[PDB]
Amino acid sequence: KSFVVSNQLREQQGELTSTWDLMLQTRINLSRSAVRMMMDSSNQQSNAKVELLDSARKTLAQAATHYKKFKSMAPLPEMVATSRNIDEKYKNYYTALTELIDYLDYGNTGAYFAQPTQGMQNAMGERFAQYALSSEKLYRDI
Amino acid sequence: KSFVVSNQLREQQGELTSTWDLMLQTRINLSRSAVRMMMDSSNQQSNAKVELLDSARKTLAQAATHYKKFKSMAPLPEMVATSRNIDEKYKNYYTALTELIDYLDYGNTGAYFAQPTQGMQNAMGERFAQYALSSEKLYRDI
């Protein structure tokens, strides 16, 4: 099986890297918007806060597109548990990120700061590292 | 050559994913610190601004460790140009990120906001996508 199966593994990793990366980029643009919503309107800097929130929204939608691609390539047997785990972490971090867009949609920075977002970022981050370790080891077995 | 060479390619991609990801995480923690340095001292939220700057510093040092690992696996002939390009983009974004740590080290948020960091983030991001496209196509040729 080795070509077809190991290429499947690389394509599942690429798509997951694209999902993780675009969620970190959503986190970044939500951050850049929240600081400008705190600084108010006099501040020359405050004025891009809606562009930034719009960029955040756009990269989350792109993370969700790559994730569905990732989910369409069925996990190989040994990959099933980390892939299940990734899905759990992914949904908690996607949701955190969605609620943050929802708050800034109406300028609620108080609720933005009150969400413990980093905890969820970190859990996905560790899931990602575990998926990547597990896929390297099947790839050097395939 | 196919096993040894295609494994080399996957290991160079993994290390580069680790570099890109840790630089995005440095960007995130610098962001979280800059907003708390803007909010001042009354603000319960302002008080983690030095922990956050310290986390940023730590993930940049980790991005630089994985990058040296990436650079130690010599680019295969067709990968030499994107690998050169990645190095250029990487150094401009590593430097941007370093100057941002340097500003927040003494609470200079004015200089933090004045740096056009995102432009450099974006150039590295496009380099990364181009490297990943080019490596997929050599990998399906190897």
Side-chain angles (χ1 to χ4, degrees), chain A residues 16 69 80 103 105 108 118 125:
Chain A
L16 187 67
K69 262 287 288 168
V80 165
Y103 298 136
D105 275 340
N108 189 355
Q118 195 77 350

Coordinates of all heavy atoms in Angstrom, one line a residue, chain A residues 16 69 80 103 105 108 118 125:
Chain A
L16 N -4.4 19.9 7.8 CA -4.5 20.3 9.2 C -3.6 21.4 9.5 O -4.0 22.3 10.3 CB -4.1 19.1 10.1 CG -4.4 19.3 11.6 CD1 -5.9 19.3 12.0 CD2 -3.8 18.1 12.3
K69 N -12.0 19.5 4.4 CA -11.2 18.7 3.6 C -10.4 17.8 4.4 O -10.2 16.6 4.0 CB -10.1 19.6 2.9 CG -10.5 20.0 1.5 CD -10.3 18.8 0.6 CE -8.9 18.3 0.3 NZ -8.8 17.0 -0.4
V80 N -6.9 7.1 13.9 CA -8.3 7.4 14.3 C -8.4 8.1 15.7 O -9.1 9.0 15.8 CB -9.0 6.0 14.3 CG1 -10.4 6.1 15.1 CG2 -9.3 5.7 12.9
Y103 N -18.6 38.9 19.8 CA -18.5 40.0 20.7 C -18.1 41.3 20.1 O -18.6 42.4 20.3 CB -17.5 39.8 21.9 CG -17.9 38.6 22.8 CD1 -16.9 37.7 23.1 CD2 -19.2 38.3 23.1 CE1 -17.2 36.5 23.9 CE2 -19.5 37.2 23.8 CZ -18.5 36.3 24.2 OH -18.8 35.1 24.8
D105 N -18.3 42.1 17.1 CA -19.4 42.6 16.2 C -20.2 43.7 16.7 O -20.6 44.6 15.9 CB -20.3 41.4 15.9 CG -19.8 40.4 14.8 OD1 -19.0 40.7 14.0 OD2 -20.3 39.3 14.8
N108 N -18.2 44.6 22.1 CA -18.1 44.1 23.5 C -16.7 43.5 23.8 O -16.5 42.3 23.8 CB -19.2 43.1 23.6 CG -19.5 42.7 25.0 OD1 -18.8 43.0 26.0 ND2 -20.5 41.9 25.3
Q118 N -7.1 31.5 25.4 CA -5.8 30.9 25.2 C -5.7 29.5 25.7 O -5.0 28.6 25.1 CB -4.7 31.6 26.0 CG -3.3 31.2 25.6 CD -2.8 31.8 24.3 OE1 -3.6 32.4 23.6 NE2 -1.6 31.6 23.9
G125 N -3.3 23.3 20.3 CA -1.9 23.3 19.9 C -1.3 22.0 20.3 O -0.4 21.5 19.5

